[PDB]
Symmetry: D3
Subunit: 334 residues, 6 copies
């Protein structure tokens, strides 16, 4: 998949495309409709399926540092776009271009001159151009007889509107299961493992992995979650009895160092230290709220209840195998 | 108007004065009673009307950094004192002098030796001298046959005691209208315009002006307010279609960068960038509470409702012309 | 009293001991049971009474910076241990040793090899060894026919379980009286006096002493407390009319500089400045919640009510003379 | 003079302009040559004289926070431009536009479509377009018979090349005399006066005014300088015996702070406190390097030598006429 | 290769090992001698080759934050060890164990009980046990007829002693060529690429990749260097025309930040943005010292000289064969 | 000895005093001359000997945070004054009083009204009153026949002028021997011992005590020094084999911290941890400059040389008798 930053970087010889336009933060189930419609039409005409997206978040252009929390990093937005068969991602920076353009010169410049588009696919809520004057309705009439438009209704399911906003709310409430349901996959973060408390290994109280994320990263509410930890492919040696590319059962503790988030993972039935490695943490279900511990005894007692509840939640998760990982490790007991 | 810092700076040849004593933070309607009484008596005897005030706030002497928020800066206290016809302001620093003095030596030193006072005017709540032993009652009997005293009852109106404290509470609640009612004018701050998001001009989402204030500055609760923005007199060139000394209709957004306050002003129907200029923001009425925005579309939709509600509130404000500005700019519509 | 850091520092020739094991934070009334039982048995056999304790807090080993607030500093834990007749304190660092040891090798290494113990005394809640597998029950059966064990029931009194946790809760609620009741003495902190507002002396609004404590120090909730201030023995000159080693009546103001705590002490009926000195502040009873002051007058009015209420509370405290100080200064009135 | 941010802000109905392009930082004597040729030409054909300038500094686009120090602020660059009769300033942001654009498109878009120039004036060192390929030569050969092009050589005078760089070097070494000579005026900074040491007035040791400047502001080397301070036009009252709009002889002390630079002005033969005013400080000549003081006596002794030496240097500046202030205040002796 | 944290993590069923002990920071050519003798011996008797190394650095145990800069991270020390065929790394923490232990007990516990070594290999400068009393001699005389001991002299080559220290000195002066020569390979750092100036692509001035490193990471002196950048194996898409697993000719700019070090790579003849990838940067030769830029033209001029000089130096590196990358990309001209 | 803050704190019933006025920072041998003449005179006429001193430093009143480093704290200045038999210290704050006061009023108010002095003793360099106009001469001519005035010349000895300044210079260069010689005693700092590297005891490399000092505290140049450490009188238990009130031979390492200065004491031939105690550290002689260590072996090697060299230098200090501690502990060899 090609990734272009700004219209100037798009090749001039690109002859045909089917284009979809949005922030696509989270690539949730609504976003997948747009991507699917786009990829299908591109196959039909032998064109490329292009996603036009935005970075920085268009909101932070007008209101710096008051933009919505990023459900996925931009890099993951790329990976997700690819996984649903997008051929090229054009990334637009509204501080550089396409902000003050009229709806008319936007269609002309972006969809025609730059992308040589024959089809465009947007959500009913899509807007564009100076002061957001261009709507889904504008696009259909500016494009009349120039390129076909397909406006897709916002996705409603089980009485919930599926959007970046609702995914953020579920995450913020700690309801990862509903977030997962809306995303169409386990919500996950990825990151390098740093040193934490003591060492990963024989001791149950020491995390198998510690990770840190900047405050622009959307994360579940502080608490303990059941989920899966996967060491991303690597040739570097791993300390302990975990193998790369296998999804291990884990009780996951999300915290805050006072506004900057930690993820501390206790991998079930494994003695490992993952320092140095890049690790994916998939969230499955909420286990408990954060609590302060009065003693080592009380701490480990609770840690053991976490493990128990996680084993139950994950044994269930594996049965919904469309969202479960391919290769996993979960023991029936300790 | 003369401004003296400490008794030592008051000229020795000053022969007669009518004196009023207080913090006078905000110069609210109660303060105006004292200033009026003082100026009138000074006219009568051909004396100077002197305000003795305090800086730092007397509270912060005993309790550093736990003093009340300053309704006006000291500089504005000066400007306000002048506007009601005070001839000289003596500013007292209790860390330098007049703290450990008995009520007796206070009257002797300040009112007689320093100010050559024939009349003094205080509020019923006025205190002075070591451990605040001197009251309004003390002053009348220490001054018996030495200078005339006039003790003015605290101002009650519409069931509200008008004081610095109540003005702070209204400000803190976001009720600028009641604060304004108590102040006898639109509450305002002044400050240099810095760079903010993008540039002031054609784009509605970009503030016409961004300002920052330290946390000792009393400001309305975070939210959006209707008010008026005035470029203070200047010869420096102005970017866009705003003229100096004219009060422009503006939706004002008060925020916090996390405890340090921003004021972001969206001037109605004008394309301007006020970087470099000194700007006065007058607050008129509360419009809405702060909210987080999920998209550019939702942001501008709300921005447009702000403008609408501001136009209404300001069209009303102009009709109460004792508080409205002399020269204003407000359009009937977009 | 000897103080040893780590098993390596314990003398090899130590021939017999009676040992008690715990964090002992606060040395509350429950802790005193264990210490008393231990000292009594050590007297019987002509052995040394040894306390094994822990530093850092065992919780912070697994969960850095999320450990319980220290009721006493370690230094005070030493002083308290001594005051109840402990002969030696062994301080264990779980990052250095005794964490991954089995219950068996723990008893062998610590109690036998290191301490040459003939008696051990623990609380019913005591645990030890890898993943806290060793309980009070384990200890009795590992030690069968090797050394006598005495497991003491947790102390319940007046429907309250007396523990570090409950003492922290009372402190956190501002209920020092109940904390005191649980500790078996007035809760106190000690620390050097720094410069604060103005100078200690004639002025009532200026603290006699200002102190600062790091955020790991357990302190009562912000507010004003009645208590006693004692200048710890010194040959250094004291400014004003306070003598060392005498416990002076004081209204104590606990605050926060924003999470880092201040203690500002207003010594009743004394003009003193305690800069430079080491000072103990004993807390007796809660007086009022913190409040913001609108004027010097209101501030001193409230300060005077504090003094009044403190005089009452302390006059009562002196009558419970088991917790009252030996030599005190309290005037009947101003 | 108008100020436009980006090509899109430029009036579309602009028929004819004389244009000069450059950073113009400092508006030094070399820059004046460009502006003069442009302005004299503009009042030739009866068109508008336009400056195209850049903010942020083009170097900072590539090396953020490693651009050269601003000789003047952008605000002052505007004011200086206007003083030399520029009719409009167009401000280009290279992060936004005109960056990746080829030399060919740059001339067409900026000079033709946007500005409709009949005449352009650049320095022989002018470079533009993608990868700075376009040079002074490119400009003459791309403007074929459409707009006339006048290329001015860099200014050499007294063996010294006059550039923003050489001005920065002079400033940096503390040679304000040579900086001024290259600038064609006294180097100055402008800023609000804040609080500092004590209060301005009778005491020689307390500054008349304190100002702080960010690390992006070019200032002379740490030390003491002869200069003039002017209170910018204002109706706000002045504490002490200074008028606005008069340049007052001052010894000026420039210090640093572990950003952040301070300017402390000791105004000669005046007792005043300038808190709250906007104040322009002009540098004339270096007096001495910074030094630490061991006693009050030494500081006051040296302070008196600073005044004597300032008195002399400023006398010379008045007689050299050329750069002196129109209205000033300077006593021959104390 | 296995990785064990502490003696307790070592498999208890380990019957036979060949062991080498040392910090091994950098795994330089002197270190390779130790590893080779150990590995060749291990595949002799058919046992495991073990490295005993130390983290944190033993110097930091005594002088926290004053230990020598890490030539490689511990992660890289593992990878290098594995590359030279070490079967297990055992990592000792001196705060935890083997510190206060006498020479006698150190050999028994570590080499015998834990590792069951038949053979140990140390550098002649090896010291161990309490107060570093145990030396290369102690080791031969304490291992009497149990395990054979091979002491290797420090490596001298071309008159230079090869040590972690001499490598650090070379790095520190910017002599990466000599550092590499002592290391036996190109010195490298590895890290995630983050955002920086603009976006990687068409523009020469914007880096292909930006990386930041803590102050504990040894880096060459501030300046520009010839090197190779490699995108570490990944299935994540690459923006622009680079493959993973190919070393690309790059000019490398190493800067500082008032920790904290930056590495900015300008990849030759490629338009790419490497945001989000893990990237290995190899240093070959110094090009020039850091310098400030006065204009875009100068920066681009110098940038082009950096490319020419890199092009040459890298050609020499390819032909010198020995340290060149297996798969690389380098154009002869632009 | 009494301590009074401000003229108002001085007893009103003071009939007769002998007074000395000065900063007295360090109470060096020149200062002792002043105190001696004052004290010998006070026990002459049978009056009180009074020191008038200043806090904050008068230079800091004018140049905040740019005053000279305090040779001793104000606490220590009090203690030293008392040791030389001063009966009362009166501490003047120049921000509060005696600043703008003319020479005439200064003598009347301070020396007469406040202190009722029959005799005053100043250094020939003494200056006072507004703008330091009043000199040693002014004092003799303003005290006409009321109080006798004894002016003492600055102390010259061995060609060196003894002043706070020359002491600071000696300290700053690391020449504590010359500082001590000018002071008349071992320069010392006093402070609570906190935690540092490991724990004090058996290991040579871990300091017996760690102390930190603000940047306002004069300390010898970064490096290692011979000195004596004394545990200040206490009933708190000592961990290890040190008594309070004995000076113990120590090698002293003074470091810096990107304020903030550290003092790490390695007590010779003692295994102890002094956490929590107040500790006085005396400097005798410089041993070496600071250096970085490459290995544990090197650090311990150098540490042993520090001990040998300290052992020698301290032997000389004991025999030179004059400045040695009364009770000390120093072994001839290890």
């Amino acid at each position: 998949m090609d990734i272009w930053y700004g219209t100037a970087a798009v090749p001039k010889d690109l002859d045909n495309s089917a284009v979809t336009i949005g922030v696509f933060d989270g690539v949730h189930r609504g976003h997948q409709k747009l991507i699917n419609a786009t990829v299908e039409k591109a196959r039909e005409v032998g064109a490329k399926a292009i996603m036009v997206t935005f970075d920085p978040h268009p909101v932070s252009v007008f209101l710096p540092r008051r933009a919505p929390l990023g459900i996925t990093t931009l890099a993951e937005r790329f990976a997700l776009a690819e996984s649903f068969g997008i051929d090229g991602v054009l990334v637009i920076d509204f501080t550089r271009e396409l902000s003050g353009t009229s709806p008319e010169k936007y269609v002309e410049f972006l969809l025609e001159d730059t992308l040589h588009a024959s089809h465009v696919v947007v959500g009913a809520n899509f807007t564009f151009g100076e002061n957001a004057a261009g709507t889904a309705d504008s696009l259909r009439q500016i494009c009349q007889s120039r390129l076909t438009v397909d406006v897709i209704d916002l996705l409603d399911d089980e009485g919930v509107r599926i959007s970046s906003t609702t995914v953020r709310e579920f995450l913020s409430e700690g309801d990862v299961a509903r977030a997962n349901w809306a995303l169409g996959r386990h919500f996950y973060v990825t990151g390098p493992v740093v040193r934490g408390a003591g060492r990963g290994g024989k001791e149950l109280g020491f995390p198998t992995a510690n990770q840190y994320f900047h405050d622009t990263v959307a994360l579940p509410a502080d608490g303990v979650y059941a989920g899966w930890l996967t060491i991303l492919p690597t040739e570097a040696p791993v300390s302990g009895n975990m193998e790369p590319e296998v999804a291990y059962a884990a009780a996951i503790s999300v915290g805050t160092n006072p506004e900057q988030r930690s993820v501390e993972s206790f991998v079930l039935d494994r003695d490992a230290d993952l320092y140095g490695h890049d690790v994916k943490v998939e969230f499955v279900d909420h286990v408990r709220a954060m609590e302060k511990f009065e003693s080592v005894e009380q701490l480990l007692e609770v840690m053991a209840k976490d493990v128990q509840k996680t084993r139950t939640l994950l044994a269930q998760d594996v049965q919904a195998h469309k969202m479960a990982p391919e290769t996993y490790f979960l023991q029936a007991e300790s």
